[PDB]
Design a protein around this ligand. Structure first.
Ligand code: DGT
Ligand code: DGT
Ligand code: DGT
Ligand code: DGT
Lengths: 481, 481, 481, 481
């Protein structure tokens, strides 16, 4: 055959169609070898050395597995080789837009460097996909294997970012709506991107994943829902789906939002902001970009990877001294110090536009405790983390279709009360972590008093160690006693 | 070179002190080789071939690991070799009282054969332990290794069943209270027995365990709580403790309370009740016992194992024809056919004694459908399942002591609201299963109509497939529409 | 009836065609739930609780996987669903003939109980398969799914035992010759039966296997070899096939031929020989058989399982006292004591007829050391184990066909010298284990002197601990110095 | 505790003493986060993203485990906390000297760039260890925790490189000789560095390790050998040690010497040779070094990592155009083309002195075939691979001390003949791989004819695909027929 075989520790032997190999063997795809999946998490979990490259091969493989399983069970769906290849390409290419240290780049750096711009890795993936196709002559290779480039490039982009704008899609009609639920599920978040990273991250972190995606694929069918053909899970798998979201949330709490992994991502972002005026990345026509402007030119963005960290760390330029000093503090493990964690008790989230006021509010708290050192706004980092089941306040399982054994092609709905009284009553919450840039004993003691007083003033939850770190502050709050 | 080493697929190489080897190499302990850990579960999960013997080795190993870890971090606890051996023996011996097919025996058979008696496997473990020690001359071997048999045999039994009767224990004092939390934790259920069966059952079932017992052991300390020294977990582990109980509940729903596993245990129990007049087990002085009376004589109970199933299946005695016919139907997979599952609404909490009228109630339902068949009491089985976090309505984490990094000796409490708003708001519920002894198509159609009608009449939850199995019944209930 | 799914810890979710489910749900197949895969090995490796039932499901699954992979890559082979079902059934039923404790029954017991008869589990499998088909009305169900029972039952039997008697097979012609190398490979022993047991045993034993059967299946094709169509492996897999046989031999050394596992199997076989005059097994028309004659009647053999061990252990019959006493010594761990291991030198090979003389020869040795104890022939057990690569003196890889990427259509041969100088120069050897029934220190000291002297007298290899156990004997042998 | 815990996917929770944390949190140690364990192997096995950093934590952990196990079983050894910390430091620090892409750097690049110098990663580890200690004020911290830096730094260096010059060591006396066998075993190569890499590489590559280092540690003791106390293994582990070397060889055959991973390392080395003049690395006093001279100054070497690859790939400088074009061909997968593999027969050995002449010899072969293209020396790469059991022609197991259970303090030697006739007769062999820098069809056809002709002329082994790639050449050699 002309298929290549790649051995992966998660999936075993992955067979790749020659069109997929041509897409993978490009500078635009190979770039993902130099972007860590968990960014700063590697500095907490040493097994987490994995890159977006191997995750992308796994997403492309699982996308192919699911569409083949549906076509084998229900030939009447008329799934073509063309459909299979287009779903695999979208799976392979949905991580193309990631920047240095993955979620650090679009979650922390671009918001602070370029607040005027609205940028996501998903839009990056669509722009990088266009640059990959056009720079490497892929459209004629697509046609050679039976694809229709105009329709199928549209279909691939829609699978990653949704409608580029009643059926809102142009790449495929309503009778193939199920194809859009495999790579990036906009309806309920159940997709092969999560299935790969749960298993891969768990393998590398040394933590346990409870989600059985092979069982899910075996039980998956397509059903009619409101004039669309969609993916329906077997009714009895509903508990396994609730457990999938519980697992996702558990992996966010223990690993992806680890308090020290997040501070290392914050310190790396700070070094990038201090380096951004001085690093030059050449793009199209020899034009020079910066870390923050390389997102505007895919030829420049192609060369923007975790390498930026080492380019700064190893620099001799006096201009890069400040950026270099922050990364040196990461190496000596002189990190900003974790003060504590709290949650809002209210139902209205802290909004992103309020994030910058929060350090001033902590510094404005007046703890009734003797303090030697006085801290300022600039001494505090306040990190707000949205934890949910992928749909804000909504239950994603209310947006899943199920079938029963007696009518395997008829969609039904299952409510939370039909499953268990032991499930969550709420599907979204915020975590607030506070850190201090002053690392001495006296500064950290003070930071704790300001923190717990701010919690009390804002009616947030009592920090788990509140009575130990702030014994004179916690008694003032009756809700805490 | 006095110790023996056993290779276990869960724990790797387990070292056993010579005293432990002498206890294991007895007819009373080796009997656990012939009792399946999951009983009827093996007939649904063919990986689940494992027996109570290998689970017991694991419990004794983990009990040793925890007591050694505590002694090591806190030498001021004065943990002795004597304390370590007594904890390991209680760990190895806490499963000794299990009968044929494990929880089938004390969960289904003894309650129906001997309703007057209050029998648990734990009381069995204490009686079997006494018989093991006395039949095999163990007390002199205990003295040889520094144990004081009067105090230490009391300690071992108390670790399994609790106070044999202000400090209610005689085996060890208040300053060693923590030792009583290792093998069977009566305060919150967090103990090494669960840690072994999560990891061992997951390995055999082919399902994944997320609980990292090694991490928990590494972070565990002893703290002063109300004039006792108790085990305190690091504050940061509180999320991992909620996950442990989530995993336990997930394993109950998927595996231990599998609808078909439960009906096979029900059919085996029915065969045992029909064989009980005829089967003989030889006990002390050649006296004959029955399946139901072997619990009264430890020499007889020693020979009461899963072998009873095959003695019935292979019998030629006409008296055993009815018992043998039930087991033959298991082999042909002619099982009582699953009709569906429902839940009580409100706080309707069947605490037992109504199990007898439930089949009559289903048959008394009047579904508004044309049926060719009419079924009665003898055609229905109704199973009640209590699902909880081990303490009925209570949150076990409210009964855990934590410590913080800044004051490792100060016990604190952590409430659900200090952890996450995404946790369960309830910790207990009931499931109701219904099955039909008639297996033909006409009888199964009728049984479905009676079932869904009964659910509607009792205001139970709508069965997940209700609209497909009973399309003419479901519209009568508006709460369902 | 539709597909069933069984969750297996080795293979994950196995889908079973309704015809396969009907074959599995019979007393003849379900019997395999009560036969331990590794027999006495469970008494050394407590993870090894697995039975022939779950191994058989795995063999049927892998047989399906390989035939599907060949048919997918080479549609010109004309592989039919009929062919796939027949291969799966042969895979499922190849273990049907196993007796109590698997290889102990046909390897040790039947040869000693019935030396006149030639019995193998393979012949048993064919007889049990015939009994299963005829007793359970399978033929009509076969016809319903497109099988032709006359040809296809012949084909199934030939896959298990070979030609029942130029092409020697009647079930399929030469153009489907490759179908006969999947379930039981008579040409080189590379088959799906080994692939399942390596992975299953390793998972249960707690030991690691290096054989990637998925990779092998991915690279497998069918090639013309001397006017047959045979399975050909990719050239690059030749190293992995040498490693497969090294792994098998390693698992035999560590596990299947463990010295203590083998002595437990020896003691069980002795108990069975002592019980054989007295145990009655009812077969067809109420005729009575013995353990050794149940092989003559499949209705009797259906009820001959590991249960016979417990029937003896729990017996009160004075006739069974001697048999029962041996099994009681196993429970107390009063086993015959391993003295040592040696090998014949040069090409010297001990014949089966001479096994019985070996205990007398050891007892006839004259150590030339002062002993207070004299041992007799009856005090020694001598176990002779033939270790090979499954074809006696032959290299099985000389009987593999390979293909290169430059010409997938040209079958080639690869010699040992084309692969590595680090491979074995011999493919068969014999190990001789000696054990002593007298366990006291004086008796074992003496047994050691007799053993090392016998080795010296026969010119066998120096036992590894020779100089320590027999320091006065080892210097007399110059070939050892 | 002031101990840190690191979660590792191979070892679980690793506890680190504060002195070890101070050594790890340095630029010299953290550098190992940017060196791939398997270099070019990542470009063949996408799971192999792991770096030397996490391997080094595992080696330090296992070194601790082994020394603690010996001290617990044999307190009379008088193993001190000082001994344990010195062994852990040597374990952590033995990989410090690795350069970019690990074995590529000292195996391929330095020998070609600086043929006059004799450099190994081991010498690098000692020089960087000295730089780490001196640059970061570690000597005072060592004294604070009871180390004596004069003796103990000597001891650490000797563990990595051997005697810095019959007891040849100065760091510890003969009665602690066993300490020198833990991190880098110069006597037989059985050490904790291999144990970590087998498990860690197998986990990432997705291939299986069968070496059980925990079992080995459990059975290890210290014995008297020629006035030294050395590590003695249990005699029964001799089979498992032969298997350890077999696994090592298999990992080299499949992974570390993969033909494509080796050609990618060759192409990276070629890019580094083309860039060596132009890349400037600042060392001590602002002096500038090259890639090839950074080994001369540890301040420069600290900044020499896999980053060099990306600095070249992302350069715009015309000086780096040639180097950059080689790396761009790697990204497009336009690699030098593998022609074939052969071996010298019997004891024939190619020495390093031969390596440069080999391409000319292949080009000098005169295949009797019509060729369109004529190839030159410059068009061929010839890679010579030494495969052995770590001691050239010698059997490492002849250099192991064993002990038997009858006398645990008596060291014994076990020969190959006392173990098995199925073991290797030879412990060293050579592979010769030939590649072509011309990648078109006509040049590859020609290269194959020259290669197979050269094999025939030198009496090398027939390439496995010889009959297919060179059907007109193979007939000249009758031994090849
Ligand atoms: N599990 C496993 N994977 C292997 C082994 N050898 C290589 N691989 C992996 C490395 C790659 O991810 C993948 C493909 O390498 P292969 O040696 O199968 O093919 P390659 O293209 O190098 O050779 P070819 O062009 O077919 O001659 O398989 C092995 O023995 N076991
Ligand atoms: N992982 C592993 N387990 C093994 C191996 N050989 C034996 N075992 C298992 C079987 C038992 O559960 C445990 C102890 O068996 P051994 O063969 O070490 O001890 P045995 O008592 O037969 O020998 P001994 O009394 O020490 O001469 O280890 C092996 O090579 N690998
Ligand atoms: N991995 C895994 N296996 C499960 C789970 N639930 C059941 N199994 C296993 C048990 C059986 O070997 C296999 C199929 O059992 P199911 O519960 O799917 O089938 P059952 O015949 O009870 O249900 P059905 O006839 O389809 O209503 O899967 C689960 O949540 N995860
Ligand atoms: N297996 C496992 N590892 C975890 C989990 N949370 C964190 N880790 C890993 C990350 C690190 O490699 C190691 C120690 O991390 P911790 O979060 O326990 O330590 P950290 O220094 O952040 O907390 P501390 O200074 O003790 O408050 O454990 C978890 O839930 N499970």
């Amino acid at each position: 055959d002309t298929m290549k075989v790649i051995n992966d520790p998660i999936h075993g032997h992955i067979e790749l169609h020659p069109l997929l190999v041509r897409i993978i063997d490009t500078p635009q795809f190979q770039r993902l070898r130099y972007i860590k999946q968990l960014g700063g998490g590697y500095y907490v979990f040493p097994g987490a050395s994995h890159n977006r490259f191997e995750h992308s091969l796994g997403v492309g493989y699982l996308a192919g597995c699911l569409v083949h399983a549906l076509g084998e069970k229900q030939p009447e769906l008329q799934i073509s080789e063309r459909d299979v290849l287009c779903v695999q390409i979208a799976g392979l290419c949905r991580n193309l837009g990631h920047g240095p240290f993955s979620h650090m780049f679009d979650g922390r750096f671009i918001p602070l460097a370029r607040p005027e711009v609205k940028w996501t890795h998903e839009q990056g993936s669509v722009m990088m996909f266009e640059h990959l196709i056009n720079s490497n002559g892929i459209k004629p290779v697509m046609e050679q294997y039976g694809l229709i480039p105009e329709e199928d490039i549209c279909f691939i982009k829609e699978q990653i970012v949704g409608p580029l704008e009643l059926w809102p899609y142009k790449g495929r009609p309503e009778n193939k709506s199920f194809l859009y639920e495999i790579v990036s599920n906009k309806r309920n978040g159940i997709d092969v991107d999560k299935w790969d990273y749960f298993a891969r991250d768990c393998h590398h972190l040394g933590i346990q994943n409870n989600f059985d995606y092979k069982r899910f694929i075996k039980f998956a069918r397509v059903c009619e829902v409101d004039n669309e053909l969609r993916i329906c899970a077997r009714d009895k798998e509903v508990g396994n789906l609730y457990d999938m979201f519980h697992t996702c949330n558990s992996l966010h709490r223990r690993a992806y939002q680890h308090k020290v992994g997040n501070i290392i991502d914050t310190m790396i972002t700070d070094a990038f902001l201090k380096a951004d005026d001085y690093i030059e990345i050449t793009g199209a026509g020899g034009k020079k970009y910066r870390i923050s402007t390389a997102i505007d030119d895919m030829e420049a963005y192609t060369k923007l990877t975790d390498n930026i960290f080492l380019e700064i760390l190893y620099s001799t330029d006096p201009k890069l001294k400040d950026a270099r000093e922050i990364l040196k503090q990461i190496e000596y493990r002189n990190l900003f110090k974790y003060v504590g964690e709290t949650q809002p008790t209210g139902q209205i989230k802290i909004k992103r536009e309020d994030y910058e006021s929060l350090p001033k509010e902590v510094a404005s708290a007046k703890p009734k405790v003797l303090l030697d050192v006085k801290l300022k706004a600039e001494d505090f980092i306040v990190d707000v983390i949205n934890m949910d089941y992928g749909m804000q306040e909504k239950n994603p399982i209310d947006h899943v279709s199920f079938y029963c054994k007696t009518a395997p092609n008829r969609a039904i709905r299952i409510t939370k009360n039909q499953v268990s009284q032991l499930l969550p009553e709420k599907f979204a919450e915020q975590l607030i972590r506070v850190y201090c840039k002053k690392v001495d004993r006296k500064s950290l003691y003070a930071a704790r008093q300001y923190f717990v007083q701010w919690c009390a003033d804002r009616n947030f939850t009592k920090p788990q160690d509140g009575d130990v770190i702030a014994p004179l502050i916690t008694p003032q709050k009756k809700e805490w006693n």
